[PDB]
Amino acid sequence: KVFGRCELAAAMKRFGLDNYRGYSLGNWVCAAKFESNFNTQATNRNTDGSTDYGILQINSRWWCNDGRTPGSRNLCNIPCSALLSSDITASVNCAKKIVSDGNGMNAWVAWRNRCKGTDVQAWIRGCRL
Protein backbone atom coordinates (compact mmCIF):
# COMPACT_ATOMS: atom_id res chain seq x y z
CA LYS A 1 0.00 0.00 0.00
CA VAL A 2 1.39 3.40 -0.98
CA PHE A 3 0.20 5.98 1.55
CA GLY A 4 -0.94 9.48 0.82
CA ARG A 5 0.94 12.14 2.79
CA CYS A 6 -1.99 13.24 5.01
CA GLU A 7 -3.34 9.71 5.25
CA LEU A 8 -0.04 8.49 6.74
CA ALA A 9 0.20 11.57 9.00
CA ALA A 10 -3.21 10.77 10.51
CA ALA A 11 -2.37 7.11 11.00
CA MET A 12 0.89 7.99 12.76
CA LYS A 13 -0.92 10.58 14.88
CA ARG A 14 -3.52 7.96 15.80
CA PHE A 15 -0.74 5.57 16.82
CA GLY A 16 0.87 8.22 19.02
CA LEU A 17 4.01 9.23 17.18
CA ASP A 18 3.41 12.98 17.34
CA ASN A 19 6.12 14.17 19.71
CA TYR A 20 6.97 10.61 20.67
CA ARG A 21 10.34 10.92 22.40
CA GLY A 22 10.38 14.56 21.41
CA TYR A 23 9.95 14.07 17.66
CA SER A 24 7.09 15.97 16.11
CA LEU A 25 4.91 14.40 13.42
CA GLY A 26 6.61 16.13 10.51
CA ASN A 27 9.76 14.18 11.42
CA TRP A 28 8.09 10.76 11.10
CA VAL A 29 6.28 11.63 7.83
CA CYS A 30 9.58 12.95 6.37
CA ALA A 31 11.47 9.81 7.42
CA ALA A 32 8.81 7.60 5.79
CA LYS A 33 8.92 9.71 2.65
CA PHE A 34 12.67 9.37 2.06
CA GLU A 35 13.02 5.89 3.48
CA SER A 36 10.28 4.18 1.48
CA ASN A 37 8.49 6.90 -0.46
CA PHE A 38 5.32 6.00 1.56
CA ASN A 39 5.34 2.34 0.41
CA THR A 40 4.73 -0.39 2.97
CA GLN A 41 6.19 -3.04 0.64
CA ALA A 42 9.61 -1.47 0.11
CA THR A 43 12.65 -3.71 0.75
CA ASN A 44 16.34 -2.89 0.40
CA ARG A 45 19.23 -5.26 0.87
CA ASN A 46 22.36 -3.98 2.58
CA THR A 47 25.99 -4.91 1.91
CA ASP A 48 26.30 -6.89 5.15
CA GLY A 49 23.49 -9.18 4.01
CA SER A 50 20.67 -7.73 6.16
CA THR A 51 17.56 -6.19 4.53
CA ASP A 52 15.44 -3.15 5.40
CA TYR A 53 11.68 -3.63 5.47
CA GLY A 54 8.60 -1.47 5.07
CA ILE A 55 7.56 2.11 5.30
CA LEU A 56 10.29 2.88 7.86
CA GLN A 57 12.91 0.52 6.42
CA ILE A 58 13.54 -1.40 9.62
CA ASN A 59 16.70 -3.53 9.48
CA SER A 60 16.75 -7.32 9.91
CA ARG A 61 20.14 -7.44 11.71
CA TRP A 62 18.58 -6.18 14.98
CA TRP A 63 14.82 -5.68 14.88
CA CYS A 64 13.16 -8.47 12.95
CA ASN A 65 13.56 -11.98 11.69
CA ASP A 66 13.69 -12.75 8.02
CA GLY A 67 15.34 -16.15 8.33
CA ARG A 68 18.36 -15.13 6.28
CA THR A 69 20.46 -12.81 8.45
CA PRO A 70 22.99 -14.88 10.45
CA GLY A 71 23.39 -13.02 13.73
CA SER A 72 20.11 -11.09 13.58
CA ARG A 73 18.78 -10.10 17.03
CA ASN A 74 14.99 -9.77 16.37
CA LEU A 75 14.38 -7.17 19.12
CA CYS A 76 10.84 -6.28 18.05
CA ASN A 77 10.01 -10.00 18.02
CA ILE A 78 8.34 -10.15 14.64
CA PRO A 79 8.97 -11.77 11.25
CA CYS A 80 10.14 -9.01 8.90
CA SER A 81 7.28 -9.70 6.48
CA ALA A 82 4.96 -8.17 9.12
CA LEU A 83 6.49 -4.74 8.43
CA LEU A 84 5.28 -4.92 4.82
CA SER A 85 1.59 -5.12 5.73
CA SER A 86 -0.86 -2.39 4.73
CA ASP A 87 -1.55 -2.01 8.47
CA ILE A 88 1.42 -0.08 9.85
CA THR A 89 0.86 -1.05 13.49
CA ALA A 90 3.83 -3.43 13.68
CA SER A 91 6.12 -0.91 11.98
CA VAL A 92 5.03 1.88 14.33
CA ASN A 93 5.48 -0.30 17.42
CA CYS A 94 8.91 -1.43 16.33
CA ALA A 95 9.96 2.13 15.38
CA LYS A 96 9.01 3.26 18.91
CA LYS A 97 11.47 0.71 20.26
CA ILE A 98 14.13 1.81 17.79
CA VAL A 99 13.84 5.57 18.48
CA SER A 100 14.16 4.85 22.21
CA ASP A 101 17.41 2.86 21.73
CA GLY A 102 19.47 5.92 22.62
CA ASN A 103 20.28 7.49 19.25
CA GLY A 104 16.85 8.85 18.55
CA MET A 105 15.90 9.21 14.91
CA ASN A 106 19.55 9.20 13.72
CA ALA A 107 18.93 5.45 13.45
CA TRP A 108 17.31 6.38 10.11
CA VAL A 109 20.04 7.57 7.76
CA ALA A 110 17.55 9.21 5.39
CA TRP A 111 16.12 11.21 8.31
CA ARG A 112 19.57 12.34 9.46
CA ASN A 113 20.60 13.27 5.93
CA ARG A 114 17.42 14.77 4.53
CA CYS A 115 15.06 15.64 7.35
CA LYS A 116 17.21 16.65 10.30
CA GLY A 117 17.27 20.42 10.70
CA THR A 118 14.87 21.09 7.86
CA ASP A 119 11.38 22.56 8.17
CA VAL A 120 9.72 19.22 8.87
CA GLN A 121 6.38 20.94 9.57
CA ALA A 122 5.96 21.30 5.82
CA TRP A 123 5.29 17.55 5.73
CA ILE A 124 2.02 17.81 7.60
CA ARG A 125 0.83 21.09 6.11
CA GLY A 126 -2.67 21.02 4.63
CA CYS A 127 -3.68 17.94 6.59
CA ARG A 128 -6.67 17.86 8.95
CA LEU A 129 -5.17 16.21 12.03
- What are the domain boundaries of the chain? 1-129
Burial class of residue 8 (count of CB atoms within 10 Å of its CB; 0-12, 13-18, 19+): buried
Annotated catalytic residue: which of 7, 52, 66, 87?
52
Q: Note the helical H segments in the chain.
A: 5-14, 25-36, 89-99, 109-110
Contact 29, 5 (CB under 8 A): yes
CATH 1.10.530.10 is right for the domain spanning 1-129: yes
Known binding residue 87? Answer is no
Whether 7 is a known active-site residue: answer no
Residue closest to 28 by CA, chosen among 102, 74, 75, 88: 88
Does 35 participate in catalysis according to the annotation?
Answer: yes
Whole-angstrom Cα distance, residue 2 to residue 56? 13
How many residues in total does the chain contain? 129
Resolution (A): 2.0
